[PDB]
Design an enzyme around this catalytic site. Sequence first.
Site, PDB file in Angstrom:
ATOM      1  N   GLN B  11      55.290  30.513 -13.199  1.00 15.32           N
ATOM      2  CA  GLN B  11      55.696  31.242 -13.031  1.00 15.32           C
ATOM      3  C   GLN B  11      56.602  32.754 -13.722  1.00 15.32           C
ATOM      4  O   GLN B  11      56.838  33.151 -13.625  1.00 15.32           O
ATOM      5  CB  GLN B  11      56.792  30.732 -12.666  1.00 15.32           C
ATOM      6  N   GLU B  71      54.707  24.564  -9.650  1.00 12.73           N
ATOM      7  CA  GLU B  71      55.343  24.397  -8.226  1.00 12.73           C
ATOM      8  C   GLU B  71      54.904  25.450  -6.907  1.00 12.73           C
ATOM      9  O   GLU B  71      54.945  26.511  -7.869  1.00 12.73           O
ATOM     10  CB  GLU B  71      56.512  25.146  -8.944  1.00 12.73           C
ATOM     11  N   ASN B 206      59.424  39.297 -26.981  1.00 15.34           N
ATOM     12  CA  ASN B 206      59.893  39.850 -26.017  1.00 15.34           C
ATOM     13  C   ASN B 206      61.792  40.478 -26.257  1.00 15.34           C
ATOM     14  O   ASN B 206      62.387  41.110 -26.384  1.00 15.34           O
ATOM     15  CB  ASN B 206      60.588  38.723 -24.743  1.00 15.34           C
ATOM     16  N   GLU B 254      32.901  45.861 -28.833  1.00 14.99           N
ATOM     17  CA  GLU B 254      32.894  46.583 -30.164  1.00 14.99           C
ATOM     18  C   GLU B 254      34.459  45.615 -30.460  1.00 14.99           C
ATOM     19  O   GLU B 254      35.281  45.855 -32.365  1.00 14.99           O
ATOM     20  CB  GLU B 254      33.556  47.569 -29.625  1.00 14.99           C
TER      21      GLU B 254
HETATM   22  N1  LIG Z   1      55.000  36.422 -18.686  1.00 18.29           N
HETATM   23  C1  LIG Z   1      56.120  36.200 -18.355  1.00 18.29           C
HETATM   24  N2  LIG Z   1      57.532  35.764 -19.153  1.00 18.29           N
HETATM   25  C2  LIG Z   1      58.455  35.222 -19.067  1.00 18.29           C
HETATM   26  C3  LIG Z   1      58.751  36.288 -17.978  1.00 18.29           C
HETATM   27  N3  LIG Z   1      60.712  36.095 -17.695  1.00 18.29           N
HETATM   28  C4  LIG Z   1      61.363  35.612 -18.759  1.00 18.29           C
HETATM   29  N4  LIG Z   1      59.706  35.158 -19.611  1.00 18.29           N
HETATM   30  C5  LIG Z   1      59.214  34.395 -20.683  1.00 18.29           C
HETATM   31  O1  LIG Z   1      58.259  33.511 -20.202  1.00 18.29           O
HETATM   32  C6  LIG Z   1      58.782  32.327 -20.810  1.00 18.29           C
HETATM   33  C7  LIG Z   1      58.503  30.829 -18.972  1.00 18.29           C
HETATM   34  O2  LIG Z   1      58.053  29.285 -19.633  1.00 18.29           O
HETATM   35  P1  LIG Z   1      58.100  28.570 -18.855  1.00 18.29           P
HETATM   36  O3  LIG Z   1      59.774  29.171 -17.559  1.00 18.29           O
HETATM   37  O4  LIG Z   1      58.125  27.217 -18.428  1.00 18.29           O
HETATM   38  O5  LIG Z   1      56.708  28.848 -16.950  1.00 18.29           O
HETATM   39  P2  LIG Z   1      56.106  27.773 -16.639  1.00 18.29           P
HETATM   40  O6  LIG Z   1      55.632  27.169 -18.300  1.00 18.29           O
HETATM   41  O7  LIG Z   1      54.884  28.989 -16.155  1.00 18.29           O
HETATM   42  O8  LIG Z   1      56.392  26.840 -15.931  1.00 18.29           O
HETATM   43  P3  LIG Z   1      58.088  26.923 -15.171  1.00 18.29           P
HETATM   44  O9  LIG Z   1      59.209  25.870 -16.485  1.00 18.29           O
HETATM   45  O10 LIG Z   1      57.776  26.076 -14.020  1.00 18.29           O
HETATM   46  O11 LIG Z   1      58.384  28.401 -14.700  1.00 18.29           O
HETATM   47  C8  LIG Z   1      60.892  31.841 -20.476  1.00 18.29           C
HETATM   48  O12 LIG Z   1      60.640  31.143 -22.284  1.00 18.29           O
HETATM   49  C9  LIG Z   1      61.070  33.409 -20.689  1.00 18.29           C
HETATM   50  O13 LIG Z   1      61.385  33.286 -22.070  1.00 18.29           O
HETATM   51  C10 LIG Z   1      58.504  36.919 -17.286  1.00 18.29           C
HETATM   52  O14 LIG Z   1      58.641  37.086 -16.146  1.00 18.29           O
HETATM   53  N5  LIG Z   1      56.960  36.685 -17.556  1.00 18.29           N
END
Ligand SMILES: Nc1nc2c(ncn2[C@@H]2O[C@H](COP(=O)(O)OP(=O)(O)OP(=O)(O)O)[C@@H](O)[C@H]2O)c(=O)[nH]1
Lengths: 438, 438, 50, 100, 57, 62
Positions: B11, B71, B206, B254
């Site tokens: 997510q 989820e 970020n 490349e």
């Molecule tokens: N790729 C992406 N990363 C984000 C975004 N917003 C915040 N993040 C960072 O990405 C990380 C998200 O990791 P998780 O929340 O564990 O996502 P996940 O492992 O897929 O599973 P969940 O915890 O259920 O969401 C956080 O530490 C944020 O700092 C976003 O919009 N896109």
Amino acid sequence: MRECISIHVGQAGVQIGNACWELYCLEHGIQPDGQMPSDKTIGGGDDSFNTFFSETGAGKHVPRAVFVDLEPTVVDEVRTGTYRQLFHPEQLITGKEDAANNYARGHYTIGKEIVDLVLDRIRKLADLCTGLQGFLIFHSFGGGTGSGFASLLMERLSVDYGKKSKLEFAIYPAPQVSTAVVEPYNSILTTHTTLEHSDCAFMVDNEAIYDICRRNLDIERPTYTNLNRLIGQIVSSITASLRFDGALNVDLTEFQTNLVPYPRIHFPLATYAPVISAEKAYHEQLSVAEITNACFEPANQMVKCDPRHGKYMACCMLYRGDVVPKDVNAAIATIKTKRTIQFVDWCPTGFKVGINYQPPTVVPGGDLAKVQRAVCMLSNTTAIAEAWARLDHKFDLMYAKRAFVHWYVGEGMEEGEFSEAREDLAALEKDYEEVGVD
Amino acid sequence: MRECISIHVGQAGVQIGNACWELYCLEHGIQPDGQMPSDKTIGGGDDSFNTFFSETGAGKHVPRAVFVDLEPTVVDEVRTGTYRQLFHPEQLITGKEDAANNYARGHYTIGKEIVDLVLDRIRKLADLCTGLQGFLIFHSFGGGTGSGFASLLMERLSVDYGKKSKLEFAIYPAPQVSTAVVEPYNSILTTHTTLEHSDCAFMVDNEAIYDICRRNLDIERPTYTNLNRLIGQIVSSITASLRFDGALNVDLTEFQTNLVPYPRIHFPLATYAPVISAEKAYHEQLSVAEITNACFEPANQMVKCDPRHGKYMACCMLYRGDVVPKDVNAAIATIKTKRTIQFVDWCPTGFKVGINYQPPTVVPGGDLAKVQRAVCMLSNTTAIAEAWARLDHKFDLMYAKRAFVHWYVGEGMEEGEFSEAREDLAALEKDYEEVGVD
Amino acid sequence: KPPAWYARLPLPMHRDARAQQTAEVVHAHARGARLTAARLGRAQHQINGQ
Amino acid sequence: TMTLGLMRGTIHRCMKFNQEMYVTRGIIKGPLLKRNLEAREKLNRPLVRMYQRHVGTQLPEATRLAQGTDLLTRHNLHMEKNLKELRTTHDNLAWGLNCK
Amino acid sequence: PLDKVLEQAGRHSWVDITRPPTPRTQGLKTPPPDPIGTYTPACAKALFEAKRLLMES
Amino acid sequence: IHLPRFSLKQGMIPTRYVMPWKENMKFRNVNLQQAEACGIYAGPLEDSLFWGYSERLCHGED
Ligand SMILES: Nc1nc2c(ncn2[C@@H]2O[C@H](COP(=O)(O)OP(=O)(O)OP(=O)(O)O)[C@@H](O)[C@H]2O)c(=O)[nH]1
Ligand SMILES: Nc1nc2c(ncn2[C@@H]2O[C@H](COP(=O)(O)OP(=O)(O)OP(=O)(O)O)[C@@H](O)[C@H]2O)c(=O)[nH]1
């Protein structure tokens, strides 16, 4: 001409034929009245229907089938429904008692007094037909009444006609779901009867039909209506060769000569690829490559077995709709060269192809889609051994503890045949594994 | 032909692809219907769209990506959104449970029953593909769930596809912001499980993204709309060489050849120079000299790694829009004459130019200016040794006090693997040391 | 550095090792071929010479 | 009760001893994609065949390949057999715990 | 590059058929006459007949 | 009586193979000579190393 004769038995196997005709009427425009429109198709009875209907001088289509059943309930219902004119009245033969799932009771108490009538009917159709390549038998291995009665009927047919082939179908015993405990008994009996007089026997299971329905057709609460609709589509596809023409044509004689390699083992499995929901087919794509990938995909096969454990013997496939040999050969070459698909060195090739131009037709109010490239896949494999592997190990326990033996001996049978049934089965497993070994 | 496939897990890894396909559909004339204007561009899928949309006979551009998650919340949201009719119906695969950030949980407890389905999806896409240059995997190292599934599925697609390229973008641990305590643990696990299979990995911080945002895009309250839009433009730039033409064209092959010096260490960094807003663009001028100097500015990097602390060895310049090799090579000569920049004695030259005539794009409701000269600065430098040093001197503390490990041991792993990971990281860091030695 | 490379048997990365084990055996024959080609060529050379 | 705790560590080590060797099977049995496999100079490399040329004997690479695959399969079978015993013994101990 | 290969092969006085075989110039001598290696006897005879014919030449 | 005798089934061997030392037409007579010179094999007038997705030993179909 290129016609067959059909027999349905059991409140198992009568509604399936009912659905079969509910499908088969449209593609000839058979109005439920039974009479053709002002179009000049009627005559002696010569047109595509000539293989199923004898549209004789009355201008009405009469199916070349017979429904034999032992309980008047469902047969009287269906003959009081809408298609009563369509069916031939005493082509519907009904008793008043059952076999209560007991093979032997139905094989010795009731069989002797209706076999004369049914043989009379089959003779009276065999005379009026001319070619009679074969027959379309429907029963069930979980036969509450069809099983033993049909075994005896098939014996009498084997001894009266010996100059043609027979096709056997079976809604198979569900491996882990059991609606009946008399099921292991009647199944083992019916099998070790059929093996040496059943010409070509096919098995399907309904649990995996459910699985197909809620994987890709997505319907969470279907019924027999949908299940039998699928099965009827299958058999329609297998006989489309007889029905219409095409670039190259195939026949059940070729089916036998090209699917069974040797004596006995003649038990393939069917599969149908392009089953899909409306919107899915609406905004997704269909072509030979993906439909073939799906048809060989392990989980779409409606019998619970693993081709990855198994190894294939031969493969017949029927393409229905609009297709060309170039894409045909390209896709089949890729699939031949695929890695997971294990092919035995005894077969250099194993592919029998069929092409026909008529697209399949949907029943009004149906549930499948408007497909333009349908395919039925008929494969022989060593993956079938798992079913018997489970069945023998159920039977040995329940028969060494010998419950219900009183029930069976109460009408005249006992454990001799119960011994030779498992022994014939054992011969079956040993030969399967031996031929599987290269 | 020329096409790739997109994989989005987590997510975290979902809204990023959401904005990416937003930009993609904006640029290739793709509408929320999924069908083009009345202009004739529909067919079998053979034109500029052919690299990411399979607009089949249904006339609907079908994106060549897959979104998975554990989820259902975010996936059902994006199902309720605006683009769902475009998105393929079951290309959205969703579980019903979380992973507790536990890489071990997401790799062993639950992963064993979703990898099969996702493999089926991947094969059914790759077969309709023809060229299959590579995938675009989007996960997150500090992933709340996207760690274990990313690892396992990446491993399995490696063992089923042994040659093609793998591009993996991740969010790096935030060196001074910890939104997840076991994040270093997950990071070390991902590293020593993936480096031996991962092909080309990019990281990003970020925090530094936000730093850029309020440095030059002068908004004190940016949002994920903006944070995703920037990386979306970045990926648009990297695939521009395939989407449009140019004086010279470069490809991911490349990229891997001339961008990785040796095996193992394969972790470059990016930067977008013309991150400028409407007013500054509108009343200030643009040209090659300042865009080059801006991209080589020591602070506009998205990862905290000071070049003066580090040392360079490789540089790929990508100019998109109207631009001329005259001042291109003049400016690169000036940068080489600059003494602050430090190219190791190993590489006298490490520079690869890539030109596209087509200028990049604004988006409705955009936060960016009107760009004419654009550049991706994709460089490899030794400046990331400190990145691993900080996380190793973090991790060793928590292991020496063995905190929180009861969760992992309860779910079912052990500790010798952590031992191997720690020594692997030590080995990598010392390798950084010798390569730093000239 | 505790040595362990004696026999065992599992081979997680083996394809490329064997592929490069083909390299010296393919090269040696080319080297021999160029040697004998040299001698025969020069023989032909001054033969046609006279 | 203490022994039941002891059991799980060996369980985890043994279970990990299967995934990587399935991986090894996959990584020694090619890609199972002929279609993109050739990019790694398909087995019979053009250079290798042109080496063959006059031939006079060939590479033993197929023999060594089959050798390794066979060894992998044998140890697979042994580990699976022991695995199947493990859980049944574990849960019999558990039911003994429950009765106690 | 035939020229450079032969000169860097070691032996300078290759005999060149004509020139006398200088006993010390012979360094790397050919592998033995065998049917499988790059020394098939078909050339082994030919070098001899050519050498003697060039002797009368 | 002789019978064919191959190896087991694999997935890395191609279905066909050429044997260039028997498939080169120009140098045909000379390579026929060194075939006997090495004394390796001619045997049947027809064999192939890779019949289909498998291989056999040097002794051709014997
Ligand atoms: N790729 C992406 N990363 C984000 C975004 N917003 C915040 N993040 C960072 O990405 C990380 C998200 O990791 P998780 O929340 O564990 O996502 P996940 O492992 O897929 O599973 P969940 O915890 O259920 O969401 C956080 O530490 C944020 O700092 C976003 O919009 N896109
Ligand atoms: N062939 C067929 N079988 C069905 C159908 N629906 C359910 N079945 C299965 O087939 C079996 C039917 O066999 P039986 O119950 O022995 O039928 P019977 O032998 O004709 O006599 P009864 O005991 O009265 O039903 C059942 O166990 C069902 O699980 C169907 O529509 N057609």
